[PDB]
Amino acid sequence: IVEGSDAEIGMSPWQVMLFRKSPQELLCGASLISDRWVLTAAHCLLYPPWDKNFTENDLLVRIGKHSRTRYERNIEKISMLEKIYIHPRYNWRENLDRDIALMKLKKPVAFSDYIHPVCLPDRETAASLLQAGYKGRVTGWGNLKETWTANVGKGQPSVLQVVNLPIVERPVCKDSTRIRITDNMFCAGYKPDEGKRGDACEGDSGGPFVMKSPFNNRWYQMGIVSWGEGCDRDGKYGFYTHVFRLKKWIQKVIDQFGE
Template sequence: MALLALLVLLALAGPVGGTWDTCRGTCGLRPMAFDHSSVVPDCDSEDEDTTLGSSDGLSLLVDGPGVPSGTWPGIVSIQANLENGTWHMCSGALIHPQWVLTVARCFIEAEDTSRWEVAIGATDLAKPGPEYKLRRILRVLMHQNYDADSECNNIALLQLDQPVECSDYIQLGCVPDSSLAVAELRTCFIAGWRASPGRAPTTGVALQEAKVRLIDVQLCNSSRWYGGAVHPQDLCAGYPRGGIDTCQGDIGGPLVCKDNVGDFFWLVGLASWGRGCSGDKRPGVFTSTQHFHTWIQVQIGLVPPITAAPPPKPKPTIHTFEPEPEPESDTFITISFPKDILLRFFKNLQDFLEFLRDKMG
């Protein structure tokens, strides 16, 4: 599967000048993180931390200092520079040295993104560290069929004004293609930004994480859950009885799952919407990145857009000297000869061949 991850990235990203070498031709790596699968609380475990089910609606871990630096090197903070300060608007995932994958909902009411920025390589925006990079947004590519009312096709791409170099703190996310059985992945995480009370809108934001499980979409879409509101291109993740979920401020945040064989993570979803936070039978709904794999490649320019096949060229007309059939007659013409004429013909032909043989013999 490690080779598969490399092939996926080669198909999705492609080289971009000298920045490609710094990514070592791989994606989904977490070089600064240890094995979190046994450390991050599982909501369904018997020793569940009751703070995960608190009623304040902030269902990621909000009381801690945040995750260690470099824990999730693919997540980014998308920020708006406004007159009253710099605000964290939503999250995204770096999938290419110059492209960020996020959700269209983040930009549905944005009038001018020229002053927006993308913070990369930091977990605590108050203390971003030496690997922290800031890029402006060159352009926003929202899905052409995005519906703000139903959140259908809730996905977007951001082209950065300059590419970034990969490091221990900045890595690319692996977008799976149709060959990956996403439903079979068992170790999954969500991450989001949380602002501490009394601190500045951006400088007080730290990255938090939580362990989740993928939930069958049919169950998630049943009458007692979301009642058909989940689209085929969506995923559900969390727990049936709630307790851990994305919430306000987590929009566009990545849903990542560890590969069942290789030591890397797949970027399988982006936080899209939900009803409330961490409620019973109300898990988070995520845009499935796998569903939009080809769309992503087309937008980045790695594959040509899919167009309608051109009409077939007319076949050349071949003129023959065969007599045309009479109207309403068979296409094939049958010509018959009397039997005695045919016998004389073949007898003369045989005599002629014997004559030639004697002359040449």
């Protein structure tokens, strides 16, 4: 993440890491929304211009960790997937619209001090909390700068990191990019004059952007880290998938299988 801090132990229990089986490499982050369900950005799985097109048997998920690397011995759980669901209207080609994806674990996970769901937002928690100026929190392992060229400082960080970012208002977003923004996307991060830095960066795609609800003291996944022109550029803002505006789809696919 650019310009952020170490995470605390237990600070982000819904944080999954989408890991690649062979070879071992880290693909993105993701989030734990249930005992069996993990939510990520679609482009972490299907992105044609990059011959990144994965399927169950390629991904391996790892819940509950802090270190980017260390095995974390009776802390973190590796598991594997049963199926994958991409929003079937994902526009990878023009503007990454609708970058969402549901992934179904083969076997449900045991919650813990370190492993716990985040909540999906509801109408009235969307309305109150997604507003200009309000900060949210973004999480990830994932580069420390623009290693777009190899670069000026830290690399990829040893341990999960955090950052708090204010949401921006729509025109400012609309006007910072040539790319056509859509209603399924909000931005966030500082304004060149506001005098702070910090943003998601490559490796963070798919992770959650969360906020904390002052009405019930609960954590909420408001958005998924989706895209950006770069990392931390003055006067560019990061784009996040509006989870709430997509909620019915999330509902429909979990009310497919069960018990």
